[PDB]
Scaffold this motif. Structure first.
Motif, PDB file in Angstrom:
ATOM      1  N   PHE A 124       0.800  -1.215   0.000  1.00  0.00           N
ATOM      2  CA  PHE A 124       0.000   0.000   0.000  1.00  0.00           C
ATOM      3  C   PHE A 124       0.836   1.271   0.000  1.00  0.00           C
ATOM      4  O   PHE A 124       0.345   2.318  -0.450  1.00  0.00           O
ATOM      5  N   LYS A 125       2.071   1.216   0.486  1.00  0.00           N
ATOM      6  CA  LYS A 125       2.953   2.374   0.491  1.00  0.00           C
ATOM      7  C   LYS A 125       4.375   1.909   0.748  1.00  0.00           C
ATOM      8  O   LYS A 125       4.619   1.134   1.677  1.00  0.00           O
ATOM      9  N   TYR A 126       5.306   2.384  -0.073  1.00  0.00           N
ATOM     10  CA  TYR A 126       6.722   2.081   0.081  1.00  0.00           C
ATOM     11  C   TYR A 126       7.345   3.154   0.964  1.00  0.00           C
ATOM     12  O   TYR A 126       7.445   4.318   0.563  1.00  0.00           O
ATOM     13  N   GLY A 127       7.764   2.760   2.167  1.00  0.00           N
ATOM     14  CA  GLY A 127       8.312   3.701   3.119  1.00  0.00           C
ATOM     15  C   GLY A 127       7.684   3.557   4.489  1.00  0.00           C
ATOM     16  O   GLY A 127       6.474   3.340   4.603  1.00  0.00           O
ATOM     17  N   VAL A 128       8.497   3.675   5.540  1.00  0.00           N
ATOM     18  CA  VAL A 128       7.993   3.500   6.893  1.00  0.00           C
ATOM     19  C   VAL A 128       7.127   4.690   7.283  1.00  0.00           C
ATOM     20  O   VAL A 128       7.377   5.833   6.875  1.00  0.00           O
ATOM     21  N   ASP A 129       6.074   4.422   8.054  1.00  0.00           N
ATOM     22  CA  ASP A 129       5.160   5.441   8.548  1.00  0.00           C
ATOM     23  C   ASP A 129       5.190   5.496  10.070  1.00  0.00           C
ATOM     24  O   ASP A 129       4.155   5.636  10.729  1.00  0.00           O
ATOM     25  N   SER A 130       6.378   5.380  10.649  1.00  0.00           N
ATOM     26  CA  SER A 130       6.543   5.391  12.094  1.00  0.00           C
ATOM     27  C   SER A 130       6.567   6.835  12.593  1.00  0.00           C
ATOM     28  O   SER A 130       6.240   7.780  11.867  1.00  0.00           O
ATOM     29  N   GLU A 131       6.956   7.021  13.857  1.00  0.00           N
ATOM     30  CA  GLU A 131       7.018   8.364  14.427  1.00  0.00           C
ATOM     31  C   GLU A 131       8.070   9.222  13.735  1.00  0.00           C
ATOM     32  O   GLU A 131       7.933  10.451  13.681  1.00  0.00           O
ATOM     33  N   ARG A 132       9.117   8.601  13.201  1.00  0.00           N
ATOM     34  CA  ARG A 132      10.163   9.346  12.511  1.00  0.00           C
ATOM     35  C   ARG A 132       9.753   9.638  11.073  1.00  0.00           C
ATOM     36  O   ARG A 132       8.989   8.884  10.461  1.00  0.00           O
ATOM     37  N   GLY A 133      10.251  10.750  10.541  1.00  0.00           N
ATOM     38  CA  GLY A 133       9.934  11.148   9.181  1.00  0.00           C
ATOM     39  C   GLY A 133      11.137  11.657   8.418  1.00  0.00           C
ATOM     40  O   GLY A 133      11.848  12.554   8.888  1.00  0.00           O
ATOM     41  N   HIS A 134      11.378  11.096   7.236  1.00  0.00           N
ATOM     42  CA  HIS A 134      12.504  11.490   6.400  1.00  0.00           C
ATOM     43  C   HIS A 134      12.074  11.496   4.944  1.00  0.00           C
ATOM     44  O   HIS A 134      11.305  10.630   4.512  1.00  0.00           O
TER      45      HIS A 134
END
Ligand SMILES: [Zn+2]
Lengths: 209, 98, 704, 636, 62
Positions: C333-343
């Motif tokens: 559904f989405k490539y990339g982590v959606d955790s508390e951190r954002g880059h």
DNA sequence: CACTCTACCGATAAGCAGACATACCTCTCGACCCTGT
RNA sequence: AUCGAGAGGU
């Protein structure tokens, strides 16, 4: 640490564990069974039944909360290899007995594909289990992430955000544990949330297909 | 097994149980001689016949080796299931139990 | 200016060079410079240096430092703030000095410079720093002489005494198990670290050789003193005879003393003379390395081809979800982590990742197998195993094998847990009549009744197992089962074999007069059908078979299993809790395995194991005993548990072989595995199942 | 562009009720050659001081024979997996295998015991039947001829019973000619019957070395005792890899064999053709020379010599173009050995004979190996030593099966029991003393196996040997210049082969020997000679990594450019490269000093100063003065 | 002599250089060419036997 | 209400042959046979 | 021009 190896027949402990896991599975199913019956322990079962098990006492029943015809059950009828005629006879017994006919029919041994063809003769779904596949419960595992299933009014709000059908959603086959332990017909996403402490919020909405 | 030879012709002797005399005899098939020596016709054969566990906290003499083979067994002196620690014999050969 | 951020390790690919690090170290060793020297280095800088560090002193006048040179080499304005260095407009405040932390510090510096301003500034900084450093060293010079490889005869005798002390356990290495081999590896590593600490006292070796790297330490110690072990029994590339009946004879022909434990305990080094036997062993080890390397280059090529023939159509769409070219299927559904951190990662919508994950998974394998590392061999093998799993499989060794944890004792008494561990084996071993037999006799008895047969099987006194005359009981039930079964054709004389009975009365001793042994524990199994000795003989050869073989059930055992061994493992790998232990206790975890009774459907390797152990409540049903495989957790738990067990093992293996984190790529690969209905590998049958399930019409791929 | 060949002419004599058969290629420097002829005819007639020989010019291309390594065929080979002992031999008819097994063809299932059977002329005959056929009289006698001494009770009583049951199959194995006939029937009822009376076959294809049948039987005894002793575990199966069980076949057997294949084609053509004339001219018309000639050449060119055992297949890797790039590439191309296919690794018998450090790296790693410097292969000794052996006490093996063999130890020559000896230790000693007084062949190897009570003496071709100094003569002969021969004769040196070596206790060096003279019987001449020609000259070869010295002795030594050729006009090679000013190294290895050849090192001495130079020398790059390269260095 | 298994020792190699006049461990003082200033690190310099390969650069370029 | 007897679907092994030598790129050195007009 | 084989740097 003298291990008090159970001199009682292993069949008794097997039947007790199987019935306990089945009653907990039906509790998870959302059926009304007395929690006092689920609270029965191994020593209580041994005191009531003895050390030699009996295949005559197998009655288990349940009921639905808000439905009018939904009542599934378990019968440990299988102790040796049986035929289609045995399943047909027990089905005719529960058909001439009452209307709760739909139930689980566990088997102590391997199943035959003729029985799988014969379940279609009955106008309801069944779940062929094993007497060893109900000896260790699931959902009480330190590695199983909790599975939640939504209802078809907020799950239907997946075309709002994702705008995607269940075919493109990550699949799950209706032969695994947590898909044959709750009861999942096609058309409901299992919103898996990873409670593994190393796993972050990797929700995938893994639906059945 | 026992091996015998015909005195007369140096041949293999075959065992034959005489039902009349109720005694075992050995007669050569090729020619004509028989007798008994010990009545011990045997099918003798030598039927052919592991360190799975290991310790990590058993006290040693001076260096703290903590190496031994622990396994539950029964002693010939005192009956009962008891842990039998196969010590590495640092200063004593006798095996000590817990 | 766009491929600086690596999609494999996550850090800058412009790593540090040998000459660059050496020059920077020899320049930081001298904090203050002269006047002409400082001016000549700045020339290669970018801007001038108005303010000097040291204005006036006793004998020196204007004296600068390397910090201002690095400042004028730095960009115009920057603010790193990396908890160790502060900069404000090309003004460095503090710069820590260590043994190897300078590389990590400058790596953090360049990463901050790249994320702050851009790639062009970092390129200019590198182009301004490289010639400056090259010039700095050039004036100074660096070389290694023979004094750097000093033997230090006192330390040499110390190392020889350590070798004499460490050679004692060499006799019990190749005989007991592999745990002693791992302990030997640990001891060798400790001695190697000691020798490296005793060797790095020089000025050039410490500045030219890394310290935290184990490969550098090995290659430095092996060429100065105490050449490492070079003959092991784990390698299958060579034959075991070369170490069973060749090296011992060589050492006995050539050496005076026996010295049977002289296999990889060679005392010579590369700086000193090497004995001919040592040279022979070294050439054998070199040949083993070369053959392993050739296979390591050959087979992972085919592996990469196989895993690349399938990962060429995974590309994200404009919606942000991972889509497939065929049937417009969705993988993620989405490539990339959606955790508390954002880059703001370099991954965009129209960028292929399946090919990227393919290359980023084929890279670590290559390294692990190109090198002859036995530690990395096990790690590589596990990864290889996970890359070959198939939808259809039959009785593989991995599936039957099941781990077996326990429950901690409530009492907490010392060895209570261990008491439980030894006890559970006793209900899962498979002792058999054979093990216990020691002889086989047949005597003639004087005379209606007619029974002249007394096996006197003569089992040894292994009463440690404790089996009773209850042996007779399993033999009786087995012969009853054999006789009751009449559906089999051409069966033995079961009607006459019912006369078997065991009786130990300390008076059955009727052995030959030779030997004068006079043992006990006989066995009086006899079967009679006639009087002629030929029928007695042939009958005996047939039934003998059922007993030493079939009577497994007799003592301490269940069938449908081989054995049970206790193996200590780290609990942090399988579970992550808030009150975890140091994973160093002597806790022993069993490993059952199943004996071709996995013939059962799919995997009942579990179903068979939970059934046998039903008479032990010490077995815990949370933190379950998981089968050491990939396809069996598909049947035990859901697809989520298989996903987790795959991603965790791949992450652990990648962290063991490499340092870069590829959690997103591992998750993408594990999801690519879950498309055709079952966890399938990258092979021919897997590709056929993928083309049949997802309706892939591509004859060209299969034709290639 | 022509083959230096030589014409081979034979005397034929066709009678009805000196033709040219072909041309073999000659090897430069061989006896046939005109360049070996006499004294050097003319250095000027083309020769290069560097060239030594060993090559064949085939069609304008020099070609060389990489020796091939094959299994010994003069010993019994026990194999553990199928439990077979074998007497392999080249003529297919000769192979005899006694093989234990749980036979399910006629015997019972696995519950029964294994039994010993033989395989001769594609037949399945029991063993005891055979013994009787060859003249054993009673079962006791036979047991003595297979004197398992050890009592491993389980095995013996099984073999005995099974053997006796396979014997009763024949109606009268024990008495009369029924056993012999049983055999006869069997041999004749096979797919391709020999069509020769059993009695001639027993003498003809069964153990051709022995003469009498009784004697042939005693040998079937040794052959079984071994399979038995092995099963019991006293002796060990043979390792295909160890050299002691291998022979190296050079350019003699390889030339003999291809001609044999071809001569045959010709004889077949001649006959076919002669028939046409006979049915319903000079001999020459009938026999075609082309057949041998063309054939040999096609082999040398296309490089496909015939398979040693399979009869219609062609092996490749027997000939290879000589490389003339530097003088040494040629020397190391003529000393290579190959094993067609734990074989890719060094072994402890390759000591002194093949080099442990150098090998090709690539597909052929391990398989192609290079000889050591001081190793000499052996050649068939034409003289036969049996009589001599008898002179030293050795008693003939008695013909009668009945006799006891009380304590004698068997003596076996090139694989045939020829004698019995009493005190082996004494016998071996005398025999050795003769070898060193030059009264017996130099290349004979005497091995006394204490364990199996045998002395095995071999004198065949293919056995790698090396020289080794002996102690007592060293003590009083040297003391009281030397050509090699004088030395070998007066016994202060000797050639000791691989098996005999196992017995010897050899000191590593003169110093070591001096410390403890008594315990050592032989002393090695120099530990540096254990390596090849391209490895024994490297300084501090034991001070570097194995892979590094392997690379330097395999590829860097071959690719080095210097010293190409003394007469460069008579040669027209495709590439050649000669150093303007070549140099010898300053350091002296012993090996170069002895060989006294200078083409071994190809290069120049360069003053190096390890240092970092402005980062142009990073990562294995080299920076060099531009004025030493213009004052002449490294110019080619 | 540097025969492969009977190499001169390190103590002997180095007590030769000393008698020659060079530094025991094989290193020498070097003065920088471009500036003339003594350089801090002694450099190791000696005569080695090098070889040239047949694989020249010119043929490779295409 | 028990017996026997051969047509039919499985599971079985169980035997049967094949099938395979990562990839970029360099150089040199030989290449079908018998018979009729 | 074509094919096959052998020997190589990666
Ligand atoms: Zn007789």
């Amino acid at each position: 640490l003298s291990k008090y190896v159970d001199l009682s027949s292993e069949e008794s402990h097997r039947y007790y564990l199987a019935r306990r896991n089945g009653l907990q599975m039906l509790r998870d199913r959302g059926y009304e069974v007395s929690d006092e019956d689920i609270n029965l322990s191994l020593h209580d079962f041994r005191t009531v039944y003895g050390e030699r098990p009996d295949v005559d006492r197998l009655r288990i029943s349940a009921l639905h909360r808000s439905d009018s015809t939904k009542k599934v059950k378990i019968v440990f009828f299988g102790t040796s290899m049986v035929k289609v005629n045995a399943i047909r006879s027990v089905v005719a017994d529960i058909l001439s007995q009452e209307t709760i006919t739909g139930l689980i029919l566990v088997l102590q041994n391997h199943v035959t594909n003729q029985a799988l063809k014969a379940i279609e003769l009955f106008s309801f779904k069944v779940e062929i289990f094993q007497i060893t596949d109900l000896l260790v419960n699931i959902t009480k595992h330190s590695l199983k992430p909790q599975h939640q299933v939504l209802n078809d009014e907020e799950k239907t709000t997946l075309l709002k955000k994702f705008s995607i059908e269940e075919k493109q959603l990550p699949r799950i086959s209706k032969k695994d544990a947590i898909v044959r332990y709750y009861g999942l017909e096609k058309g409901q996403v299992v919103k898996v949330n990873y409670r593994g402490e190393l796993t972050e919020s990797h929700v995938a909405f893994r639906c059945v297909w | 097994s026992t091996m015998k030879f015909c005195r007369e012709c140096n041949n293999i002797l075959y065992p034959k149980e005489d039902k009349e005399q109720k005694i075992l005899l050995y007669a050569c098939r090729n020619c004509d001689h028989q007798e008994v020596a010990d009545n011990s016709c045997v099918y003798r054969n030598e039927v052919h016949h592991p360190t799975l566990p290991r310790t990590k906290a058993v006290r040693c003499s001076k260096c703290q080796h903590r190496e031994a083979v622990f396994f539950q067994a029964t002693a010939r002196g005192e009956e009962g299931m008891t842990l039998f620690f196969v010590c590495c014999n640092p200063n004593c050969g006798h095996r000590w139990r817990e | 200016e766009k491929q600086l951020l690596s999609s494999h390790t996550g850090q800058l690919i412009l790593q540090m060079g040998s000459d660059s690090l050496l020059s920077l170290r020899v320049m930081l060793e001298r904090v203050f410079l002269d006047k002409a020297t400082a001016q000549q280095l700045a020339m290669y800088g970018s801007l001038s240096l108005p303010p000097p560090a040291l204005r006036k002193s006793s004998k020196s006048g204007p004296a600068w430092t390397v910090f201002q040179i690095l400042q004028l080499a730095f960009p115009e304005r920057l603010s790193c703030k990396g908890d160790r260095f502060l900069v404000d407009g090309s003004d460095l405040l503090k710069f820590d000095f260590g043994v190897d932390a300078m590389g990590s510090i400058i790596n953090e510096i360049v990463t901050s410079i790249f994320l702050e301003k851009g790639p062009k500034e970092t390129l200019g900084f590198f182009d301004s720093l490289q010639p400056l450093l090259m010039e700095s060293l050039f004036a100074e010079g660096f070389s290694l002489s023979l004094e750097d490889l000093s033997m230090s005869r006192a330390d040499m005798d110390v190392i020889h005494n350590l070798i004499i002390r460490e050679i004692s356990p060499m006799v019990s290495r190749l005989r007991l198990s592999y745990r002693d081999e791992l302990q030997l590896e640990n001891s060798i590593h400790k001695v190697k670290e000691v020798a490296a600490n005793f060797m790095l006292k020089s000025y050039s070796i410490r500045n030219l050789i890394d310290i935290k790297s184990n490969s550098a330490i090995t290659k430095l110690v092996q060429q100065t003193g105490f050449l490492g072990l070079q003959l092991s029994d784990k390698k299958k590339f060579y034959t075991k005879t070369l170490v069973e009946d060749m090296a011992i004879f060589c050492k006995r022909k050539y050496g005076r003393i026996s010295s049977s434990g002289d296999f990889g305990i060679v005392k010579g080094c590369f700086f000193h003379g090497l004995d001919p036997y040592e040279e022979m062993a070294h050439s054998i080890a070199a040949r083993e390395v070369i053959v392993r390397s050739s296979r390591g280059l050959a087979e992972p090529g085919t592996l990469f081809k196989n895993l690349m023939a399938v990962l060429r159509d995974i590309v994200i769409t404009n919606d942000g979800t991972v889509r497939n070219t065929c049937s417009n299927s969705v993988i993620q559904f989405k490539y990339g982590v959606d955790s508390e951190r954002g880059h703001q990662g370099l991954f965009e919508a129209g960028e292929p990742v399946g090919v990227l994950a393919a290359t980023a998974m084929s890279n670590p394998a290559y390294k692990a197998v190109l090198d002859s590392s036995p530690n990395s061999n096990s790690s590589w093998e596990l990864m290889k195993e996970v890359l070959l799993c198939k939808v259809n499989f039959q009785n593989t060794t991995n599936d039957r094998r099941v781990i077996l944890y326990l429950n901690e004792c409530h009492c907490g008494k010392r060895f209570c847990q261990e008491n439980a561990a030894c006890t559970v084996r006793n209900k899962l071993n498979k002792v058999s009549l054979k093990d216990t037999a020691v002889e086989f006799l047949v005597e003639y008895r004087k005379q209606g009744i007619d029974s002249c047969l007394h096996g006197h099987i003569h089992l040894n006194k292994t009463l440690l197992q404790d089996w009773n005359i209850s042996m007779q009981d399993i033999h009786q039930k087995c012969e009853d089962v054999i006789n009751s079964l009449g559906q089999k054709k051409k069966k033995k004389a079961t009607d006459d074999f019912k006369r078997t009975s065991l009786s130990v009365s300390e008076c059955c001793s009727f052995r030959d007069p030779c030997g004068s042994k006079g043992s006990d524990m006989p066995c009086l199994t006899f079967s009679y059908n006639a009087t002629d000795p030929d029928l007695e003989r042939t009958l005996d050869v047939l039934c003998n078979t059922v007993y030493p073989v079939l009577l497994e059930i007799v003592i301490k055992g269940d069938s449908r299993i081989c054995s049970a061994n206790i193996i200590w493992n780290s609990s942090d790998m399988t579970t992550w809790i808030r009150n975890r232990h140091a994973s160093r206790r002597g806790e022993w975890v069993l490993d059952v395995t199943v004996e071709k009774s996995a013939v059962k459907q799919s995997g009942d390797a579990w179903r068979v194991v939970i059934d046998s152990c039903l008479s032990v409540l010490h077995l815990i049903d949370t933190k379950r005993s998981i089968p050491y495989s990939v396809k069996q957790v598909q049947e035990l738990l859901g697809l989520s548990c298989a996903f987790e067990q795959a991603v965790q093992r791949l992450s652990a293996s990648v962290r063991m072989v490499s340092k870069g984190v590829l959690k997103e790529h591992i998750i993408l690969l594990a999801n690519n595995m879950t498309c055709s209905g079952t966890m399938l590998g990258f092979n021919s049958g897997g590709y056929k199942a993928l083309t049949r399930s997802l309706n892939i019409k591509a004859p060209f791929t299969e034709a290639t | 562009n022509m083959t230096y060949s030589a014409r081979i002419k034979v005397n034929v004599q066709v009678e009805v009720f000196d033709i040219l058969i072909g041309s073999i290629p000659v090897m430069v420097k061989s006896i046939l050659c005109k360049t070996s002829e006499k004294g050097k005819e003319n250095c000027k007639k083309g020769d290069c001081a560097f060239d030594q020989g060993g090559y064949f010019v085939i069609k304008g291309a020099e070609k060389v024979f990489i020796a091939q390594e094959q299994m010994c065929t003069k010993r019994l080979w026990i194999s553990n997996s199928p439990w077979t002992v074998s007497f392999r031999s080249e003529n297919k008819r000769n192979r005899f295998i006694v093989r234990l097994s749980e036979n399910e063809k006629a015997e019972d299932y696995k519950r029964r015991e294994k039994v010993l059977t033989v395989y001769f002329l594609s037949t399945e005959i029991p063993v005891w039947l055979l013994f009787f056929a060859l003249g054993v009289s009673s079962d006791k006698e036979a047991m003595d001829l297979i004197a398992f001494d050890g009592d491993d009770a389980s095995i013996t009583n099984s073999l005995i019973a099974s053997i006796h049951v396979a014997d009763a199959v024949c109606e009268a194995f024990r008495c009369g000619n029924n056993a012999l006939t049983y055999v006869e029937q069997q041999i004749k009822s096979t797919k391709f019957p020999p069509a020769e009376s059993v009695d001639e076959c027993l003498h003809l294809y069964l153990f051709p070395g022995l003469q009498s049948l009784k004697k042939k039987a005693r040998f079937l005894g040794y052959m079984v005792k071994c399979l038995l002793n092995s099963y019991a575990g006293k002796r060990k199966c043979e390792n295909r890899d160890s050299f002691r069980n291998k022979r190296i076949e050079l350019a003699g057997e390889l030339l003999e064999r291809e001609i044999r294949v071809h001569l045959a084609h010709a004889r077949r053509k001649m006959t076919r053709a002669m028939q046409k004339h006979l049915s319903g001219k000079p001999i020459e018309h009938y026999l075609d020379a082309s057949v041998i000639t063309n054939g040999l050449s096609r082999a040398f060119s296309t490089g496909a010599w015939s398979h040693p055992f399979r009869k219609m297949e062609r092996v490749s890797g027997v000939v290879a173009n000589l490389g003339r790039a530097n003088p040494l590439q040629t020397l190391i191309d003529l000393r290579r050995t190959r094993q067609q296919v734990d074989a890719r690794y060094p072994h402890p018998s390759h000591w002194g004979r093949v080099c442990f450090l150098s090998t090709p790296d690539g597909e052929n790693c391990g398989l192609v190996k290079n000889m050591s410097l001081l190793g000499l292969v052996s050649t068939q000794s034409l003289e036969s030593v049996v009589e001599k052996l008898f002179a030293c006490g050795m008693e003939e093996l008695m013909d009668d099966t009945c006799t006891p063999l009380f304590g004698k130890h068997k003596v076996l020559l090139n694989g045939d029991w020829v004698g019995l000896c009493a005190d082996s230790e004494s016998f071996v000693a005398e025999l050795k003393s003769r070898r060193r007084q030059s009264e017996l062949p130099r290349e004979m190897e005497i091995k006394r196996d204490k364990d199996d009570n045998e002395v095995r003496i071999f004198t065949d071709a293919g056995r790698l040997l090396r020289p080794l100094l002996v102690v007592e003569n060293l003590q009083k002969l040297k003391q009281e210049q030397y050509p090699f021969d004088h030395l070998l004769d007066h016994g202060i040196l000797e050639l000791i082969g691989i098996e005999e070596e196992e017995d010897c206790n050899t000191a590593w060096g003169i110093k070591q020997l001096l410390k403890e003279p008594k315990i050592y019987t032989h002393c090695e001449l120099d530990l540096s000679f254990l390596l090849g020609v391209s490895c024994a000259v490297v300084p501090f070869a034991n001070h570097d990594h194995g892979r590094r010295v392997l690379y330097q002795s395999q590829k860097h030594c071959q690719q080095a450019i210097g010293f190409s050729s003394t007469n460069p006009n008579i040669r027209c090679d495709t590439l050649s490269q000669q150093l303007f000013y070549p140099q010898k190294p300053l350091f002296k290895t012993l090996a170069s000093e002895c060989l006294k050849k200078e083409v071994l090192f190809n290069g120049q001495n360069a003053i190096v100063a390890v240092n970092v130079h402005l980062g142009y020398n990073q990562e294995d790059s080299i920076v060099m003065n531009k004025a030493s390269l213009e004052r002449g260095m490294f110019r080619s | 002599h540097a025969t492969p298994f009977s190499t001169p020792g390190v103590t002997e190699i180095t007590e030769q250089l000393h008698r020659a006049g060079f530094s025991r461990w094989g290193n020498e003082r070097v003065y920088n060419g471009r500036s003339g200033e003594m350089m801090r690190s002694m450099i190791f310099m000696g005569p080695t036997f090098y070889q040239r390969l047949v694989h020249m650069s010119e043929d490779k370029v295409k």
